[PDB]
Structures are given as C-alpha cells and as structure tokens.
Write an enzyme that holds these catalytic residues in place. Structure first.
Site, PDB file in Angstrom:
ATOM      1  N   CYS A  80      19.315 -40.736  64.491  1.00  0.00           N
ATOM      2  CA  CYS A  80      18.573 -39.699  63.502  1.00  0.00           C
ATOM      3  C   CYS A  80      17.905 -38.884  64.306  1.00  0.00           C
ATOM      4  CB  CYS A  80      17.540 -40.720  62.598  1.00  0.00           C
ATOM      5  SG  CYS A  80      18.217 -42.047  61.766  1.00  0.00           S
ATOM      6  N   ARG A 115      16.737 -33.356  58.255  1.00  0.00           N
ATOM      7  CA  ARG A 115      17.086 -34.410  59.158  1.00  0.00           C
ATOM      8  C   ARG A 115      18.539 -34.481  59.083  1.00  0.00           C
ATOM      9  NH1 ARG A 115      16.459 -39.201  56.786  1.00  0.00           N
ATOM     10  NH2 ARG A 115      16.962 -40.234  58.557  1.00  0.00           N
ATOM     11  N   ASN A 159      15.277 -44.204  61.653  1.00  0.00           N
ATOM     12  CA  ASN A 159      15.397 -45.556  62.349  1.00  0.00           C
ATOM     13  C   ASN A 159      14.504 -45.601  63.708  1.00  0.00           C
ATOM     14  OD1 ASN A 159      16.607 -48.215  62.603  1.00  0.00           O
ATOM     15  ND2 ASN A 159      17.821 -47.424  64.125  1.00  0.00           N
TER      16      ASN A 159
HETATM   17  C1  LIG Z   1      18.762 -44.645  54.655  1.00  0.00           C
HETATM   18  C2  LIG Z   1      17.170 -44.861  54.713  1.00  0.00           C
HETATM   19  C3  LIG Z   1      16.772 -44.167  56.088  1.00  0.00           C
HETATM   20  C4  LIG Z   1      17.014 -45.215  57.174  1.00  0.00           C
HETATM   21  C5  LIG Z   1      17.699 -44.462  58.723  1.00  0.00           C
HETATM   22  O1  LIG Z   1      17.238 -43.118  58.688  1.00  0.00           O
HETATM   23  O2  LIG Z   1      18.298 -45.088  59.340  1.00  0.00           O
HETATM   24  C6  LIG Z   1      16.703 -46.102  54.614  1.00  0.00           C
HETATM   25  C7  LIG Z   1      15.161 -46.468  54.721  1.00  0.00           C
HETATM   26  C8  LIG Z   1      14.835 -47.679  53.923  1.00  0.00           C
HETATM   27  C9  LIG Z   1      16.049 -48.188  53.449  1.00  0.00           C
HETATM   28  C10 LIG Z   1      16.317 -49.207  52.071  1.00  0.00           C
HETATM   29  C11 LIG Z   1      15.236 -50.467  52.651  1.00  0.00           C
HETATM   30  O3  LIG Z   1      15.342 -50.803  53.621  1.00  0.00           O
HETATM   31  C12 LIG Z   1      15.595 -51.539  51.429  1.00  0.00           C
HETATM   32  C13 LIG Z   1      16.939 -52.138  51.173  1.00  0.00           C
HETATM   33  C14 LIG Z   1      17.187 -52.861  52.356  1.00  0.00           C
HETATM   34  C15 LIG Z   1      18.770 -53.326  52.257  1.00  0.00           C
HETATM   35  O4  LIG Z   1      19.059 -54.012  53.768  1.00  0.00           O
HETATM   36  C16 LIG Z   1      19.867 -52.245  52.213  1.00  0.00           C
HETATM   37  C17 LIG Z   1      19.246 -51.326  50.987  1.00  0.00           C
HETATM   38  C18 LIG Z   1      18.014 -50.842  50.962  1.00  0.00           C
HETATM   39  C19 LIG Z   1      17.520 -50.205  49.578  1.00  0.00           C
HETATM   40  C20 LIG Z   1      17.690 -49.719  52.038  1.00  0.00           C
HETATM   41  C21 LIG Z   1      18.604 -48.425  52.025  1.00  0.00           C
HETATM   42  C22 LIG Z   1      18.411 -47.381  52.951  1.00  0.00           C
HETATM   43  O5  LIG Z   1      19.042 -48.216  54.167  1.00  0.00           O
HETATM   44  C23 LIG Z   1      16.904 -47.122  53.162  1.00  0.00           C
HETATM   45  C24 LIG Z   1      16.838 -46.167  52.185  1.00  0.00           C
END
Ligand SMILES: C[C@H](CCC(=O)O)[C@H]1CC[C@H]2[C@@H]3[C@H](O)C[C@@H]4C[C@H](O)CC[C@]4(C)[C@H]3C[C@H](O)[C@]12C
Ligand SMILES: C[C@H](CCC(=O)O)[C@H]1CC[C@H]2[C@@H]3[C@H](O)C[C@@H]4C[C@H](O)CC[C@]4(C)[C@H]3C[C@H](O)[C@]12C
Ligand SMILES: C[C@H](CCC(=O)O)[C@H]1CC[C@H]2[C@@H]3[C@H](O)C[C@@H]4C[C@H](O)CC[C@]4(C)[C@H]3C[C@H](O)[C@]12C
Ligand SMILES: C[C@H](CCC(=O)O)[C@H]1CC[C@H]2[C@@H]3[C@H](O)C[C@@H]4C[C@H](O)CC[C@]4(C)[C@H]3C[C@H](O)[C@]12C
Lengths: 328, 328, 328, 328
Positions: B1, B17, B81
């Site tokens: 990222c 981003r 991340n």
């Molecule tokens: C994609 C985004 C940003 C992470 C990144 O940039 O790597 C991340 C941040 C928090 C995440 C969410 C949250 O961690 C809560 C959920 C966890 C589950 O393992 C997947 C869906 C879930 C709903 C996630 C979806 C997605 O991966 C999110 C929204």
C-alpha cells in the site's frame, strides 16, 4: 524509451512502446492506404506503400515519418533513441540497400509482411544519415520489429555492421547495444518473484516487512539499463505465472513501471523528460491503442475501419485531454 | 500500500492511495449521508455520522467499513497494512476513547472536520482489537489522515503508545514505523533529479548512456521501504520543479511508479499481489476519483451531487471493465 | 579475480591481483633464470626463457605454469578466470602464432620486454586448448599485461578474434568481455567521492547520517561486474585526490575492498570461494610482494637478489602462517 | 566506525572495531594497572581502577581517555561515532549515576567484570556533556560492550532515555539508532550466500557470470547503514558455514570489507576519511591485537605480560611503519 512485445491469453500479439521525450514532435496518428505515393521534397527520393500503414508520426514537409507503427499484415516497428553507439554512413554505400534514417520505419512497414522478410532484406541494407529537409540532423535511433508469429528483432547500425539481433527478451530500451543488455540480465539471476518471508540471522530472527522481498536489488532509476532490467523481469514473471490471463491492460501495467514522471528526470536544459505516450498495437486486428501523459484513457484507432484502397493519408489528433467517467 | 498527499497548481488538495492486495474485499464506493445511524450486530456499538462520508469500503453484516474515504468538510483518511509493529489492546482501556480497528476510519470521517480536531481527539484514544462479527480477526493497520490545510498525520498504535506523527513527507506505505522511514530517507541525500552527462575516470571518459543518471541508487523493488523512498522523491521532484503544473493526472503518475504488476509480487500462497485500485480524493470538491487494475480510466463520484441530508446509504459498483475510447 | 595497476608517488608501477578460488593449486613463488629450457612431457613443446621470470605458479609434471608474474624488464602478466565468453581453438591454426592456454603467461614474460612488444606479437597470435598433460582441460582465462610505462592491455580470446584491448581503467575482473565492463562504468557517472551533507525534501530536512553519502548506489556484492565497478572507482578516487601519496599499502587497501570472505561466497559444491592471496609487483624493482588469506603480512621476493644467469628454477613456499608482531 | 564481536573455533571471544576518522587523536596503546588513581585537572572528578585496563586511547592533560579497550576480566568496550541522534545532559541529573562522555569507556572497564554487571549499573546511569578540559566539546558517541560470555550490548543516550540494547547481531556502526539498523536488516531477507548458477528468462537462458550472484543487492558504499548490513551478513555467513574454522584473521577479513580507502570517502573539509586502525581483542587472553592503515601487520600487546599490580601507566607507540617479511 521502452519497447515491449507480449502475447495475450487468446494467442494475439501486442507490440508497443513508451515514448520518453522532453518535447512535442507535432505528432498525430497517421494512416496511409495501400499503393500510396510518398514523395520527399528536399531530395527526390520516393516511396510507394505496398501495405496500408497505421502509427504515430508527424508530417514534415508533407512527408510522413514515424515513431512507431504497424501494417495490415501484422508487422510492427518502433524507433527508439540510440545515442553514442550508433553510426550512420554519410552517403549511400555502393552495392547496398540504402535507407535514410528518417525513412527506415516506413520502409519496413510499407514493404514487408513479416519479420522473416525484413531479416532477409536487412542482410544487404545500410542506414544513411540523409536529412529529411535542408541540413536538419537525424535522430540517433535503433529499431524493434515484431510480427504475428511472436518473433521480434532488434536493428542497430554500428560503425562495423548493420546488426540484426533475434530478441528473445521481448523488450528494448536505449544505449548501450542490445547484446550489452542481454549480458546485463545475467547479473540479476538471483531475483525471485516469490516472497521470502523470513531469514534466520543466527541469534536474530529477520522477518519480511512486506511483500516483494525476493526482488530486492532491482534497480529503480530511469536509465536505459535499469528500465531494460525491470521490464525484462516484469514481462518474464507475468508469462511464467499468468500466461492465461494476459490481456491489453497488462501491457500498460508493465510499461507504467518504467514510465518517466514529471520533475524527476531533468535534462541539462532544465526540462522534464517524461513518458509522453504509451502505444500498444494489436498486430492481428490492426488496432493502434495509445494513451498519453495528459490523458491516461486508452484510445483505439482501427485501420480496418478505413478504406485500405483509399486515396488519401488520414490523421487523428493526439489526445491530451483527460477523459474521466463521471459516475454520478 | 502507498498513500500520497499532493497540492494542485490551483491550491486544491489531493489525497489517496494504491490498494495493494491479492484478493477482493467485496468493495464498492460507499456514500453515507449526514445524521445516519450505523449499527453493528455482533456487538451493540453504534455510530451516528455528523458529516456525510464518501469512500471505498464494504458492507459487512449491513455495517460499513472503509479502506479509504473523505467527508464533506474535506477531511480524508486511508487505512494501510501495518504488520508486525502494530499492537492493539484486547479490551477497552478505562479512561480512554476506545475505537475498534474496523471502525477507526469511519470514526475519523464521521466525527471530525479537520486534522487539527483529529489530533486533539487522538491524545486520549486507543485502538482495540474487537471483531466486526463473530471471532473474525482485524487487519493490521495504520492510517494517514489529511485535510484541506495540506497537513497530513500518521496514526500508528504500538505496544507503548498510540503514536500520531506529523507527516511532512506527504507519503506513507507499510512497516516499519513511520519514524523508521523518515530516518531511511537520509540514506538517499545523494540522489539528483538533474542529469549527470559525464564523468572523467582518469584516462577513461565516461558518458551518460541515457537520461536519469542522477537517480542511480534508487531502489526498484516493491517492498514498503523501497516504495516509500520512490514516492517521497518523485513527489519532492515534482513540487520542486513543477509546482505550478501539478494536476489530477500527476497524482496517478506518481503512484503508478510504485504500483504492483501481476506475476512479479507473489505471496506464499502463490497469488499475485497487485495494485487493485488507485484512489485520489479532491478534498475541497468532495470528488472521489479512482481507477482499477482492470480499468485504468479514472472514474469520479461527486458527493455534492447527492442529498447530504439523505436517508439512505448509497453504493456504486467497483468498475473492473476496461473503458476504451474508440476514435474511429 | 581482480587485477589492478597503480602508479606510486615516486613514479614506480605496481601491478597485481586478488586470487579468488575455492581450492589450492599447489602454488609456490617460482623464479626462472635467463636462458632456461622448460620442456613439457605430454607434448614435445619447448620454451627457452629470454628474460628471468618471477611469479606465483605451480610445477606440473616438472613444467612451470603461472597465475601471475613479472620479468626482469618490468613486464607483468596476470591470468584471471574468464568463463562462458572465452573460446580457444582445438588445434593449432595455420599461419598463426599458436600458444597453449597453460603456457600463455610464461610465453609473455619469457619472450617480451614491454606491452608494446606484446601487442605487436599478439596481432598474429592464437590461444589453443592443448592439455598440459593427459586429457586435462585448461582453465577458462583472460589476461592483463602491464609494464613500467604505466600502460596496460587486456587479452581476450573469443570465437571471432583474439582481442587486445587498451586498458585505461587500470583494472580487470572476470566475465563478461572487457568492453562490456567499460560500457557498464557509464551507469555510475552519478557517483561522488565528496560528502553530501544535506538534502531539502520540501517540508522535511534530510541530513547525512554518516560519511559516504555520495557513493550510495555502489554495488556491494562479489560478482565480477560489481567488483570491477568498485575497484575502478576506488582507484580513480585515490589518483584524483591522493596521487602524491600512493604507495605499496594503498594497492592492498583497494583490493581488500573486493576480497572474498570465507562463508559468504559459496559454490554449488558447498565450498567457500575466497581471496586466497593478493600479489603486488613493483615492476621497476623486480620485487614480488604478496600476502594470503591465512597470513596478511606482506612477503617480498626480490628477483634481483637471485643469480639471473643461474642454472636452476628456484621456488619459495607459499606462506599460510599468520605473522604477528609481539610488541611486549 | 564498525564494531564486531566474534567467537573463535576454540570458544574464545574476539571483540574490536575499525576506527574510521580523518585525523590523528595522538593515540597510543595504553595500559593502566589495578588500583591506579586517575585524576582530571579541569574538574576535580577522580577515578580509581578496580581492574587493570588495556586499549587504544590518548593521554589528554595527563588523563587517559579511550577509543576502545579491555580489562583483565575479559570485558571489552568500544566507543563509536553517533551524530544527530545522541543527546547528553548539560549537567549532572540528581539521583542518577552521572558519567562524563569522555570517561564512559574507562568507567565501564575500570569498574565492572561483565556485561551483566554493566547492564545493572546502567539502569540508573546518565551520560553528561562535561568537558575533559576548558570548553572543549565531547565527541558524539555510542558504545558497544562485550565479554567472555559472548553477550554484547549497545549503549545509546537519547533525549528520552539512556538505552541499553541486547545486541544479537554482533555488530555496530553509527547513526541512526540501533533499533533502526535491526529493522533495516529485514530488507535483506532475500540475500543468499549460495551461488545462483542459472535463471530461465522464458526464451532467454541466463547464466551466472561469476560467483556471488546470490548477494546481488548488497549495498557497497561506506555509509553507516550499508556497512552495518555488510558486516551483519558477512558475520552470519561465516558462523553458519565456517563456525569450526573461525580464527583471528577471519575477524580482520570481515572488517576489511567495510574499511574506508583513501580518496573515496571525502569530508566537507576535503580530507580523506579512512580506516586508521583495526583492533581485535582476545577477551579471555588479555591480548590487544591491532593493525593500521599504514602498517597492515597485526601487532599484539598482552596485558598479562605486565605487572597488573604495577604503579605506573604504560604506553606503546602506535605503529605506522609497514612491516614486510623479506623472504630472500
Ligand atoms: C481493505 C481494507 C484496507 C486494508 C489494506 O489496505 O490492506 C481493510 C481494512 C479493515 C478491513 C475489514 C476488517 O478487518 C473487518 C473484516 C475482517 C475480515 O477478515 C475480512 C472482511 C472485513 C470486513 C475487512 C475487509 C477489508 O480487508 C478492510 C476494510
Ligand atoms: C519521435 C521519433 C522517435 C524518436 C524517439 O523515440 O526518441 C523521431 C524519429 C525520427 C524523428 C524525425 C527525423 O529525425 C527527422 C526530423 C528531424 C528534426 O530534428 C525534428 C523533426 C523530424 C521530422 C523528426 C521528428 C521525430 O523526432 C522523429 C519522428
Ligand atoms: C591458478 C591459475 C589462474 C586461474 C585463476 O586465476 O582462476 C591457473 C591458470 C592455468 C592453471 C593450470 C592449467 O589450467 C593446467 C592445469 C589444469 C588442471 O586442471 C589443474 C592444474 C593446472 C596446472 C592449472 C593450475 C592453476 O589452476 C592454473 C595455473
Ligand atoms: C577517538 C575516540 C573515539 C571516537 C570515534 O571512534 O570516532 C574519541 C572518543 C572521545 C574522544 C576524546 C574526547 O572527546 C575529549 C577530547 C575532545 C577533543 O575535541 C579532542 C581530544 C579528546 C581527548 C578526544 C580524543 C578522541 O577523539 C576520543 C578519545
């Protein structure tokens, strides 16, 4: 400049380039129909097209000269900057097929249907430094030629010989000579596309901070050598791991990695050298795709929508107006 | 990222981003109007938006969670991340403002109008590892927050403290901690944007093969550290040399240089880590711009075309269909 | 392997090399007097020395073959590994001066008094892959030759021609070809010996962490290409900045930087490739200086202490016993 | 500066450093016997040695101050340059053990028998910027301490705290902070000591040009960060592959790789920064080994040959005269 050849998941062949320059060359997309007579005014040299031609170029003194392009038979050619190591003859060499620098690209596309035909014709060829008009010096160039067989060649005129290399790497940049870059690839045999998650440094445990630890050592600058390495390995990785998913956009993803960004590649004249455009030719279909630094949307010109037996050169305006999809 | 903040030639502020992941998170562009009640089902935690919100996220159990987004006041936030160095509390800490990981981004955008407001609120804040549903673990994250003043901050929760850094570099990637990357920048003080055309190596004359010799030493891989260096210097060069010409497309040019390409960044599970999308928020105007790996055309969603006093969450489909301009 | 030529503050000429191998070749320091008849047993090829010779080599079947050495006239020659790009003829080529691989070094030193003489003789020369004994294959080699004029040449036998390069860099390593390394030097025109103390990254001030920021980008591995770059620039810097203080120890300081260290350069056969010895020849004075991996103290053998009209080959034992000065 | 700790094949412990400076500090090898009273004149601060001490230092105003050294109990300490990130108190801090910068090294060696003892004493310690004489500023420093247990620690005084790190890497250089360098090691998890002989680049076969292809990516400059990486991995490789053959000379081989060479590391004052000396302490045996830029032969001073209950400081002259073994 960076040239690239790539085969799609559907067995079609893409060929194109980044144009990396600090100026405009009054470029337009130029279509030339079959049996069209092109005449240069300063000299008396004439060219009649056997095959219809489509590519990026400019009309200089009513005469077309190309940066890169394709013909109706699926042959593609791109001219890329080649300073220092190039050497053209001052006059025509007796007993050889003498081609003026500015005309080489058109000479390939207008006359030949394949890389194999081109290879045979180049055996007795010589590239001559004859001005397109007045006293104007020609650009220092080398060429990449590619067709629907998936074979690519590299054409480099040195002092000793007009060199024709089989290009098994699928890429080209600038100086030094092609064989130099081929030998340079050997330095990076230790590169890995697969993640290296850990390293046990004796009493210290080392852990990968993020993805991509296998490629540490890849050069990140915008010199011809570094760009050659990057595209060679990016292309290799995708063919190795994603052969059955390669499509048009992937071509652009590869070249985007070696595209120059405004401000960071400054010339001695304090101008920004940038990737002005990126072209991608779908050789089988006769479609010239391109975007520009100003407008990243891919534009398509299909030569098969034209009358190939037409009687006029057709041009299309170089698109520098950002095209946005307004969703709501 | 990779996160990026940039000021345009017209004094407007871009923030966005690259999303670099190997999977889909069922993403859509999500608009939430003012005074909208968001309720989570697994727990009983509730959130009512003070300001209208627009960004990329997903609806998980009817509850919205965001990857990056903006509000009507010109505040932007992106979650990136942050493995290994992050440390969330297991339960709420008494006396602190406790925010669940999955809700932090929305918590910022829904409640505050500026970086200054956010900075003050974060003094007594704590990010807690509470599942969004069931037992599901939260993603390891750190955040970049930016507004219309051009100020950016970085939020990193460690074992010792919730750290809030002033971000004067204009960029963020992943691990290690922000101060590590800041210190790492010092290694590259010898980089030059201006061409180095020659070097006299005693009895040997050395000549630049092509443009870009000043940046030799720049790392070219896709690790968080290397990407941080690249974007930091690409951003710096353009501000230094091209302040009065910075526009929307320049933002994408910078991030394209650190975008992951299919095939070359392979995970331990043999999947390609790629730049799935690139977002750019025009903070003043409330426009969310984005393109994707599949479709490079920039799409625009303008929150000001919506009813900000509306009564429903609105979503827009993530565009994965290559949009080509057929010229002829 | 790394070869180096250097002129001292007193106008004397040093020439020598690092020997980088994973095995012993039963080496000793070998002195051969004038008018000495050397006869090989497997074939019937004979050699009578015109000039007295001193260097590192081995006695194989009572016949001397050299790794590097000098003669009484101040001519030096070193043989370095040259895999892949080398190509020797299988048999003697009619009309050419045919020299067996194993004998080339001695052939140079025994017959000629200068680089100029050697250059002239090599015009019609050919290096042949003839076994020293039985069926034993010859080592893949290229040679650096240097004399008291300060001129150095590089001898590389390819498929097309026996190449003789003027060496203006003062160094040699291994593959690829010499002209490749010369062209590779051009990539590093942006290197600086002078400290870069600061960099203003917009709103962030960057400060040099320590000395040496100008050389960031210099490759630090032990490949032939990287070692060539390092010694070329280390040599250049010292000539530029410290011409009037160059002495014997400086030669060793330069080569120490590219010396292989036990454990870190492992062969496919799981053996450590190391710098077994470093030799330095004071060409004018006929002194062969050397140290070893085991004993870093410099040892000196002066050919002028010998009877040059002597009647016997003299050898000196390769010193592998660490020599320490016990102060108290 | 580079510090190194290494265990020999015989279970003995080596500890030492490269001294990288552009000037002489009037250094000599200094022996101080037990129960010896050292008095500073500018202030009234006094120190009585519990243990006999031997190391490199200088006598400034009849008072000894050290660059690196050992005591009779096998405790070693080295002071290395630490600019920018260091922060000493102006005056003594109430309730803390206040140690003047110039005296810290002697304070460690004179008082304590082990790293464990030192660690305990440093819990309530504070390093104060008190001049050794007049108004003379102290050098910005951090320290590495090591003993016969094979444990090493790093002492770094910042604004917030006097930090004591467990050093599991076995090395130290300069700025930034120790934890920064530890985190930086993670970038190089993709390094390999074992040869990578080939790479199949699709239709192009790539072959290793020489040995060492696995380490491509290792930084080759002389900055603190790059030197830290190099020695960390060189040390690791030798412990991994050659544990049972590590001896005295190996210590010097490792440090030689990061030694500065005259001419190439130039200060702002146009002086060459070089590795003036390399010391290696055999902690168990009380032998201080060292060589210098001018004289590469290892010199040995054995404190056990002295009267440890002696009544006088003894010094030994810094050897700058090249010692050559004249074989014939
Ligand atoms: C994609 C985004 C940003 C992470 C990144 O940039 O790597 C991340 C941040 C928090 C995440 C969410 C949250 O961690 C809560 C959920 C966890 C589950 O393992 C997947 C869906 C879930 C709903 C996630 C979806 C997605 O991966 C999110 C929204
Ligand atoms: C842009 C293109 C490719 C060069 C490159 O990729 O760097 C080059 C190749 C040959 C060039 C042309 C020829 O050199 C002839 C002309 C020379 C003049 O100096 C400019 C216009 C002129 C008509 C050139 C325009 C343009 O720069 C061309 C068409
Ligand atoms: C060590 C030296 C230089 C090679 C190098 O620098 O790598 C080489 C050059 C030619 C070599 C010799 C010749 O190849 C002939 C012999 C070949 C046998 O395989 C080993 C012994 C043998 C007698 C070699 C010993 C040694 O390896 C020599 C003397
Ligand atoms: C050389 C050594 C280590 C520093 C380094 O490795 O860079 C340093 C540490 C503390 C130094 C000493 C102290 O700073 C006190 C003195 C300060 C004066 O500026 C020079 C002499 C002076 C007596 C220094 C000599 C020398 O530079 C010392 C002994």
């Amino acid at each position: 400049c960076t040239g690239l050849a790539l085969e799609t998941k559907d067995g079609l062949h893409l060929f194109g380039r980044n144009m990396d320059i600090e100026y405009s060359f009054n470029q337009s997309i130029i279509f030339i129909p079959r049996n069209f007579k092109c005449v240069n005014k300063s000299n008396k040299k004439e060219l009649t097209t056997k095959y219809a031609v489509l590519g990026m170029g400019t009309i200089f003194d009513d005469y077309p000269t190309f940066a890169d392009g394709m013909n109706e038979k699926g042959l593609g050619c791109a001219g890329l900057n080649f300073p220092v190591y190039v050497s053209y003859s001052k006059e025509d060499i007796e007993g050889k097929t003498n081609i003026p620098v500015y005309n080489f690209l058109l000479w390939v596309l207008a006359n030949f249907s394949s890389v194999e035909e081109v290879k045979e014709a180049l055996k007795n060829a010589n590239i001559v430094d004859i001005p397109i008009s007045e006293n104007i010096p020609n650009t220092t160039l080398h060429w990449m030629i590619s067709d629907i067989t998936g074979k690519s060649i590299v054409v480099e005129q040195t002092k000793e010989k007009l060199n024709v290399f089989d290009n098994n790497i699928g890429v080209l940049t600038n100086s030094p000579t092609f064989d130099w870059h081929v030998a340079n690839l050997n330095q990076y045999v230790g590169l890995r596309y697969n993640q290296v998650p850990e390293f046990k440094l004796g009493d210290q445990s080392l852990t990968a901070l993020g993805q991509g630890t296998g490629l540490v050592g890849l050069p990140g600058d915008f010199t011809p050598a570094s760009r050659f390495i990057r595209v060679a390995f990016l292309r290799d990785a995708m063919i190795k791991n994603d052969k059955d998913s390669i499509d048009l956009i992937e071509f652009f993803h590869i070249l985007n990695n070696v595209a120059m960004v405004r401000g960071s590649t400054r010339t001695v004249e304090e101008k920004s050298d940038l990737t002005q455009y990126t072209s991608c030719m779908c050789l089988e279909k006769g479609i010239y795709y391109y975007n520009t630094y100003e407008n990243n949307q891919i534009n398509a010109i299909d030569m098969n929508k034209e009358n190939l037996d037409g009687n006029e050169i057709k041009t299309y305006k170089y698109n520098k107006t950002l095209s946005i999809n307004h969703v709501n």
